[PDB]
Amino acid sequence: HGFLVTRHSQTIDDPQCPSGTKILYHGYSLLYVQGNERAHGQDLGTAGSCLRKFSTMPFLFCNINNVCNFASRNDYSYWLSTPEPMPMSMAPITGENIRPFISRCAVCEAPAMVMAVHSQTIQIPPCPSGWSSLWIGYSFVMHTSAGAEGSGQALASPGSCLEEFRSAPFIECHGRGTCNYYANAYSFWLATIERSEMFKKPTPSTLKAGELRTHVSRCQVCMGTGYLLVKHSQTDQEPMCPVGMNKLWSGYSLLYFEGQEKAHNQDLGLAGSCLARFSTMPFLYCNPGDVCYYASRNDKSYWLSTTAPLPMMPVAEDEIKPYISRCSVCEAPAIAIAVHSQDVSIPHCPAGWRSLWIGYSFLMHTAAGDEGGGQSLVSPGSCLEDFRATPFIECNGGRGTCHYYANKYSFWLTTIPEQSFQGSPSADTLKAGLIRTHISRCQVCMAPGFLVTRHSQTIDDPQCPSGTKILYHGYSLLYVQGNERAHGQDLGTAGSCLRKFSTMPFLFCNINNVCNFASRNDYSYWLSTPEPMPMSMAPITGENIRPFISRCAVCEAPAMVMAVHSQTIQIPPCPSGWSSLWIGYSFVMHTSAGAEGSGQALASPGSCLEEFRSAPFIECHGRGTCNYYANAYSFWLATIERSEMFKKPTPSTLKAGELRTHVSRCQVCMRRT
Amino acid sequence: HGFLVTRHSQTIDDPQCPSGTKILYHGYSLLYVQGNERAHGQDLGTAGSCLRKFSTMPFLFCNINNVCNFASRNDYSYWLSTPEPMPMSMAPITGENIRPFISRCAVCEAPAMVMAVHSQTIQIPPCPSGWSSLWIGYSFVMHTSAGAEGSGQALASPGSCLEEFRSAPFIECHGRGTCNYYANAYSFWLATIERSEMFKKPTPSTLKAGELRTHVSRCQVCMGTGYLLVKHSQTDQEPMCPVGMNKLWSGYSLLYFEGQEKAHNQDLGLAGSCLARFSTMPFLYCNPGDVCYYASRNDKSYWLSTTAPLPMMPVAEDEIKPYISRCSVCEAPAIAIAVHSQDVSIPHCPAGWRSLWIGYSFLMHTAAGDEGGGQSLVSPGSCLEDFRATPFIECNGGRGTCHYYANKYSFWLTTIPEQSFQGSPSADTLKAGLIRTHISRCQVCMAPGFLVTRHSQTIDDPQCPSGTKILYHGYSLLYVQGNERAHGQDLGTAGSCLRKFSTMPFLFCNINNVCNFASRNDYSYWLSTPEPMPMSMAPITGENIRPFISRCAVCEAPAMVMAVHSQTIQIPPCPSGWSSLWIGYSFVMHTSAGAEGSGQALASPGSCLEEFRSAPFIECHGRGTCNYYANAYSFWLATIERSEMFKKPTPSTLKAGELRTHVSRCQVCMRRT
Ligand SMILES: [Cl-]
Ligand SMILES: [Cl-]
Ligand SMILES: [Cl-]
Ligand SMILES: [Cl-]
Ligand SMILES: [Cl-]
Ligand SMILES: [Cl-]
Ligand SMILES: [Cl-]
Ligand SMILES: [Cl-]
Ligand SMILES: [Cl-]
Ligand SMILES: [Cl-]
Ligand SMILES: [Cl-]
Ligand SMILES: [Cl-]
C-alpha cells in the first residue's frame, strides 16, 4: 500500500532498513530550516527529514516582484548530528570539515503502518500485541535553538524515538556556509513519571553526565496491520473504542508542550495526543554540555479539559484529575477523516462510509504569550463532539498546578450562509445561546482507501490525477493567522481544500464564553491564480476576490501518495513500484504578515506545486479585503550540485527569466497496486 | 548643563550641528541591531544612534562558559541610509561598496533641552512659544525588517523627525559582511488626520510615487528652557497642568502602535505619549518600492482608557470618545521622577522635593499576540493615579472600532512585606477589595538636579562617583518577563535600582478584575555578583539567593551624564567640558529564557558596566528559584579598526584570557559646571 518509515543513524554511515522493510534511498538527516526568522520542521519519522543532498542552505526565497535570492540574507538549516566532537577552537566548521558532523538516513517502504510507543519509564515499552518491533530508543519530543525557534516530533511517529540519546543531537548551519553547536541548542525529551507521582508536584532534578538517561523515557518503534483511531472524551472517563476496534491504550488528552516559550503540539487525531501517564511537567530538557533539567525552570503543558467548573484559584495535585480529558487509542480497519460543512447543517459522510461521531470544527488555539497551535482539518482531532469556548487547561510545570487564565482562546471554523463564497464577512459578537449556530459542524467518517489533494492554482477545478476519483472540489486554503499566530493546512491534505471561501473562515471564543467573529485583526491565506494584481495595487474586496482564489480537488486514491525532490533542474523519478501523478516545483514554506507563516511536509504532495509562482498565495483579512503585499515570501528547495554539497553556497540573486533555473523539481507518486 | 541633540544627514556627508549647538563628534547612523533574533534599537535623537566606527557586525556575544563569539552566528545590524540606488543586480553589497549607502550623523551639545512636535497634517507645526527652531521634517515613528523585528522613535524625540522622507530610509547588514534592501523593510510614519475625521472610520489609501508625502505628517525640532511634565487624566477630560506650569498642548493618551504585529510604545511620562489628534489608525507604512498603505492592512493602536463601562461589542466612531484618556504636556522648572515603595506605604518625596501626585506602580502590559510594552520606573508614566485592572483599550485600525478583549493584561509592581529581600514569594489570586494592598505605591516628585545610577556588581553598595551625592541604595534589576514578553529598565536609570528584591516583584491583572501573583511562569532578571555558581548547578532558592544579587546606588548629580564608547581596547576620552565618573566595558543587550531580552541606550551610563562578565546577570522565577542557564547571552560592542570598517568582519571565537581583547571600552562622563 506504500507505507514508509524513515530511520536516522546519527552517524556518518547509512542506517540499515529495519527487518521487514526495503530501502528506497539514503540521505542526510534534515531537522528543520529557518527562513526570515521562522522555523519550519520536518518530522523525523517522515521521508521529508531525509534529503539526498546536504547543503548549509538547501532553500531560497522569492518576493512578489519576481526576484529570488539564494544564500543572500541570513537564514539557517539544522541537521541531526553525529558523535563528532566540537573542535578545540569551538569556532564554526566550514567546507568538507562539516561532513563528519551530519547524520545519515534511510527511507524505507514498509508493508504496514509504523508507530512509536513510549514507556515514560526507564523500561522499554512493549509493542502492541500483534505488532512487530523495528527498533528501540529514547523519547525525543522537541528542540529549540537560535531565537528559541524550533520544532518537534509527533509522539506516535518513529521520529519521536531516537536510537541514541544525545544532549546535543543536532547542529546549526548558516547560509554563509558555517555550522556549529551553540549553548542555547536545547533538546527536549519525555521524562520518567511514576504512576504514584502523576498528580503530585514534580520533584525538580538537575542532572549531569553519568545520570542523564536515568530520567529519560524509552520507546519502541513497531509495525502492524490496520490503522489507528484516537478518541478524546472531553470528560474524566476514558472513551470507549468503536464496536469492533481493539483498544491499544487509554490515557490523558495532551494538546501541547511549551518549552523555552515555544509551543510544540500533538495532533488530536494522532496517538501522540494520548499520553498514558499525566504530569504537569512530562518532559525535561538538555543543553549541549551534558546537563539536563527536569521541572527546574519555567516551562508548561496544556491538556484538553472537561466540564469541571472554573476554579477560583489554580488546582493542585489530586484536585487536577477532574479537569483532564481522557482518551483511547483504537485499532481501526480504515483511516478515519473529518469532513466540515462550514454550515449550520451537519455534513453527511460520503456514501458507504462508516460514521464515527459528529461534532464542531475545532481549528486552533492560543494561550500564554502568543503560543498555541492547531488541528489538521482532515484529522478527527479537528472534530470535537462538545463545543467549548475554553476546551483546554494550562498546567504550570514545576508548580504542579493547573488553571484557566483569561488569555486562552479557542478558534473554530464558522458557518457561512453563502453557498460557497463570502468576500465581505459581517462582524459580530456572540454570547450564550446565540453561539452554536455560528460554529461549523463536522462528522468523522471511515474512508475506504486514501485521499489525494490537488490544487489548480487557477479559477478552474483541477482534474483528479490518473487512477483516482473525485470526492469534492473547493478553494485552496494555505493557512490562517489568529491572534497573531499562524496555523497551516498542509497542501497535500484535504484540510487545504475548503468547500466555502471566506476572507475570515473562523472565529475565536474566550474564557467568558463570548465569541468574536471578524471583529479584530486576523487573517486568512489562500493559494492564488494568475489573475494580475490590480494596477491600483489597492486591496480587493467582496465578489472581486473570486478570480484570485485557487481551486482544488480531493480525490479517492487506491494507495498512498508521496512527493520526491531532485534538488536539481531534472525531474526526480518515482520510486520503484510507484507511478507518477504529476510533476512540479519544490515548495517548502512561506511568510507574510508579521513574518508568520507555515510550510509543507517534503514527503507530502503539498510540497510539489505544479506551477512555479514567486507569489503563489494571497493575503486576506477579517475586514473583507485581500491583497499581495511586498513582504509575502515563498521558499523553495534550491538546486545543489553533489560535488559542492559541503562547500560554501554561492549566493545568487535571480530575476524573471532565470527563476526556475535554481528551483528544485519534484514528482508526486502513488504506490502501484 | 549637558543636553545633547543628534542629527542624521541621510547622506554620505556630515550633517551640520543646528544653530545654537556645537559639535562633539561625527559618526554613522545606527538604527538597530538584531542578536539571537531579537532587535534592540537606538533612538535616533540620542547619541547612541551615532557610532564613530561602522561595521556590518559592531557587536559580539558571550555565554556563561566564558566563550565569546564575534561574527560567528547569524546576526544583523541596521543603519539609516542615503539616496544611493540599489545596484541593478539587486545582489547584496559588500566591502567598500557599502560606504555610499550609510548615513552620517553629528552629536551636538545644546544649551537647553530639545524636542520634536508633530502636526499630523501636511503643514509644519510651529515650535512652542519661546522655543527656537532647529530643523523641520517628516514624522518617523517605527520600522520593521527581518522576522518583522524592529524598533521605533519616541514621538517627542528629535529622532522622530527625519529631514528627508524616504520610503526606504534604512539598509540591512549581516555579520557575514553583506548589506542590502529587502522587500519587507517597512517604514512607519505618522499620518495626516483631519480634526473632523478623528472619530470616523479611517478612509484607506494606497499611495504611489508622486503622492506619498500627501499623507505624511510633518514635524519641527525645537529647543527651549526648562523641562516637560506629562499628565494622563485617565478620564475623558484633559488634566490641568500643575500650578505655575504653562500648558504646551492637550491630547489623547497614546500607549502603543502595533505595525506588522510588532509593538512600538511611547513612555507615558514623555510628551510622545500625548497625541494631539486621535485616530484608530494614526500611522501609515511604506515598503521600499515607493508604495505606502494607510489603514489598508491589519494594524492597530492602543490608548490609555477611562472608567467608561465595558461595552458589549466594539464601539465605533463617536462612541469611542468616552473611552479615551486625555493628557496635557506642561512646561516644568525641573525634572519630575517617580519613586516606588514596593510596599503598602506610600513613598515620601525626598526632603525639599515638590510632590505632584500619588499613584500605583504601573510596570508593563500585553494584549494582542504577546505584544505590549512597559514603563520606565523612574518615569512619571509608571505612576498612574488610578489603579485599573485594564487601564488601556485596543483600537482595531482600519475597522475604526475599539474594544476590550480578554487577553489584555496589566502588570504592576507588588507590595512586599519583607524589609528588603523576598526570595520565596507565595502565590495568590486576588479579587475585588483584596487587590489594592498588593499594588506598590508611588509618588511623583520634582528633583532639584539630575540622577546617576551606578551598579557595584557585588553584594556591597557602590560609592556615588565624584561630585554626586547618595539618594538611596538598592538591588540591580535588569529586566522582567511577563506573559512571555520582556521589559527592561535601562541600567543608567533609577528604575534599574529597586529598594526591595523579589524573584517575582510584580503581578498581573485581567479583564475580569482578577490579579494573579507568582502563580504562572514569569521571570525577573538581575545583575549578579562574582558569587560562584553552585557545583550542583541546581536552582538557588530563598535566602540563598542574596549573595548573587548586585547592589546599586542612585545619586544626585549637578549636571547631565553620558557614556562614550571607543570601539577599541583604549579608553575613550570624555568630551571637552565633561569630566570622568567611571570607566568600563560597552554593554549593548542580552537574551535569556525564550530568547527574550532587552538592552541599553549607548549614550546611557547603563551601557558602561565597570566589570566585564560573560555572565553578568541571573535569571529568577515566580517559583522562588534563580539560576544561570546555558542560553543566557550578553552582547557587547566589538572592537573595530578604522581601516577595516567596511571590510568583511573576521569571525573570532575567544576563550578565557582573551575575552576583553575584543570588547569595546567606555567612559561615563558628566558635564562640568
Ligand atoms: Cl542566507
Ligand atoms: Cl554559544
Ligand atoms: Cl520547568
Ligand atoms: Cl488570568
Ligand atoms: Cl478579524
Ligand atoms: Cl507592502
Ligand atoms: Cl554573525
Ligand atoms: Cl526581498
Ligand atoms: Cl491597517
Ligand atoms: Cl476576547
Ligand atoms: Cl510566576
Ligand atoms: Cl540550560
Residue numbers in the entry:
A (entry chain A), B (entry chain A): 4 to 676
What's in the article?
BMs are assembled from a toolkit of proteins that includes a collagen IV scaffold as a principal component. This scaffold confers structural integrity to tissues, binds integrins for cell adhesion and signaling, binds bone morphogenic proteins for signaling gradients during tissue development, and tethers a diverse assortment of molecules, including laminins, proteoglycans, and growth factors, which harbor a plethora of functions. Second, two protomers oligomerize via their trimeric noncollagenous (NC1) domains forming an NC1 hexamer at the junction, and four protomers oligomerize via the 7S domain forming a tetrameric structure. In protomer oligomerization, the interaction between trimeric NC1 domains is a chloride-dependent event.
Thus, native C41–C42 connections can be supplemented with similar artificial connections between C42 and C41 of adjacent domains to generate a single-chain α121 NC1 trimer (sc121 NC1 trimer) combining six C4 sub-domains. To determine the number and positions of Cl− ions involved into stabilization of the NC1 hexamer, here we purposely purified and crystallized the sc121 NC1-trimer in the presence of high chloride concentration to mimic natural extracellular Cl− content. Ultimately, it was crystallized in space group P41212 with a single polypeptide chain per asymmetric unit. Here, the hexamer is formed by two sc121 NC1-trimers related by a crystal 2-fold rotation symmetry. The overall atomic structure is identical to the previously reported structures for human and bovine NC1 domains isolated from tissues. All C4–C4 linkers, native and artificial, are well-structured and are related by a pseudo-hexagonal symmetry. Analysis of the hexamer formed from sc121 NC1-trimers revealed a set of 12 Cl− ions at the trimer–trimer interface. Collectively, all 12 Cl− at the trimer–trimer interface have well-defined and comparable electron density and B-factor values in the range from 23 to 27 Å2, like atoms of nearby residues. Together, the 12 ions form a chloride ring at the hexamer interface. Analysis of the solvent-accessible surface of the trimer and the hexamer shows that group 1 chloride ions are solvent-accessible in the trimer only, but group 2 ions remain solvent-exposed in the assembled hexamer. Group 1 ions induce hexamer assembly, and group 2 ions stabilize the hexamer structure.
